[PDB]
Amino acid sequence: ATCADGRTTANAACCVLFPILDDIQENLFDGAQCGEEVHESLRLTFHDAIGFSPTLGGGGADGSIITFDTIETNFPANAGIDEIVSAQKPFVAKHNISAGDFIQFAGAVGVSNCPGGVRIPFFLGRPDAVAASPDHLVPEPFDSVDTILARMGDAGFSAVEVVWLLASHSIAAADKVDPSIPGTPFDSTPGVFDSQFFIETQLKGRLFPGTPDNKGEVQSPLQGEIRLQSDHLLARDPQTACEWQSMVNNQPKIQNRFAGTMSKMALLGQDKSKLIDCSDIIPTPPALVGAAHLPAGFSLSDVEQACAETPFPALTADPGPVTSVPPVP
Numbered sequence: 001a002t003c004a005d006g007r008t009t010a011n012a013a014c015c016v017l018f019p020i021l022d023d024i025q026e027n028l029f030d031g032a033q034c035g036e037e038v039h040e041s042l043r044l045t046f047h048d049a050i051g052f053s054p055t056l057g058g059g060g061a062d063g064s065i066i067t068f069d070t071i072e073t074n075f076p077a078n079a080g081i082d083e084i085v086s087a088q089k090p091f092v093a094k095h096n097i098s099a100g101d102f103i104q105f106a107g108a109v110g111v112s113n114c115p116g117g118v119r120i121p122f123f124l125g126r127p128d129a130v131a132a133s134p135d136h137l138v139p140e141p142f143d144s145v146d147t148i149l150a151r152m153g154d155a156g157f158s159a160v161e162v163v164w165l166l167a168s169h170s171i172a173a174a175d176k177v178d179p180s181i182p183g184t185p186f187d188s189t190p191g192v193f194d195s196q197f198f199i200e201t202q203l204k205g206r207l208f209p210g211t212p213d214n215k216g217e218v219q220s221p222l223q224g225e226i227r228l229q230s231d232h233l234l235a236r237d238p239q240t241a242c243e244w245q246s247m248v249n250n251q252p253k254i255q256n257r258f259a260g261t262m263s264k265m266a267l268l269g270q271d272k273s274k275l276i277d278c279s280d281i282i283p284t285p286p287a288l289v290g291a292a293h294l295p296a297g298f299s300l301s302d303v304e305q306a307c308a309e310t311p312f313p314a315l316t317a318d319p320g321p322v323t324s325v326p327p328v329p
């Protein structure tokens with residue numbers, strides 16, 4: 001099919017997405033960058049979608065976190081997402097797609113801006129939300145590992161799928177976990193979609209990067225990096241440790257599994273056979289930059305081995321003294 005300006009796509013319904021693509025790239029993502037708006041939009045995809053349970057209810061990836069923002073942004077687990085919900089709302093208002101489609105589309109376009117990123121399949125046609133999500137369906141970083149896995153399982157994800165979706169923490173920071181240091185990232189390369197998250201969470205903790213008594217946070221290996229309690233434990237739990245370790249220096253697997261599992265997340269509450277394939281709209285991401293490494297001054301003896309079947313791979317360290325990671329602007 002050929003769209004209004006001559007750009008093409010397999011399914012013509014998808015032509016609606018070209019001016020939306022252009023508008024969010026310029027006016028949401030600061031000129032197609034992998035920065036804070038892309039990171040918040042990616043988080044939003046999960047907080048919208050995971051509000052789904054075959055028994056507890058919720059419409060899943062239905063745009064409810066925007067349509068019913070006054071309800072959902074008041075759930076404690078949604079702290080900090082009000083900003084991106086406010087930023088996206090006028091795009092939904094202006095443009096010609098459901099809030100469900102818009103959230104997942106913005107997250108996919110966002111990921112494609114990040115060096116190392118992957119094109120996440122995108123389907124169009126989600127109906128409008130019927131009702132606010134129930135509260136208590138979004139995992140919290142202070143939840144037990146088995147609780148997080150059971151919650152994700154109830155929505156349809158295996159434990160290894162949860163590991164793959166957490167590749168998102170490779171381009172991610174926290175503003176509310178420790179509000180003394182907002183914008184502190186979960187890995188040393190929040191602008192690069194890469195394996196450093198899976199490496200750096202496996203290091204022995206050393207220090208709190210800000211204050212010491214924040215719920216859902218544990219010690220970080222690096223100044224200027226924050227570590228969630230949930231990620232710390234998922235990196236070490238028998239259900240997930242070996243899969244977590246398997247991501248290290250495995251860019252193609254991180255890309256392939258993130259894409260396929262985000263597509264599945266993006267379809268929670270929906271039926272792929274009742275939607276239109278618009279995957280060809282998503283831009284080609286930039287090449288990965290950098291290579292898998294231990295942080296400066298670390299060695300393999302600083303890794304806490306938790307995978308019972310295979311040892312953690314040796315990785316070179318960056319040269320020099322240890323360093324601080326700058327916050328996400």
Ligand code: HEM
Binds near residue numbers: 148216230
């Ligand atoms: C599996 C359980 C998960 C837990 C416990 C968890 C927890 C968190 C927390 C506590 C934050 C910091 C929010 C803040 O204080 O600003 C965060 C940020 C983020 N999360 Fe996760 N998350 C989970 C899964 C996911 C998934 C499946 C995605 C997939 C899209 C995701 C994407 C993100 C992103 C991109 C950010 C960065 C937000 C920003 O930079 O401001 N998370 N997550």
Ligand SMILES: [Ca+2]
Binds near residue numbers: 060
């Ligand atoms: Ca929802």
Ligand SMILES: [Ca+2]
Binds near residue numbers: 170188190
């Ligand atoms: Ca990264």
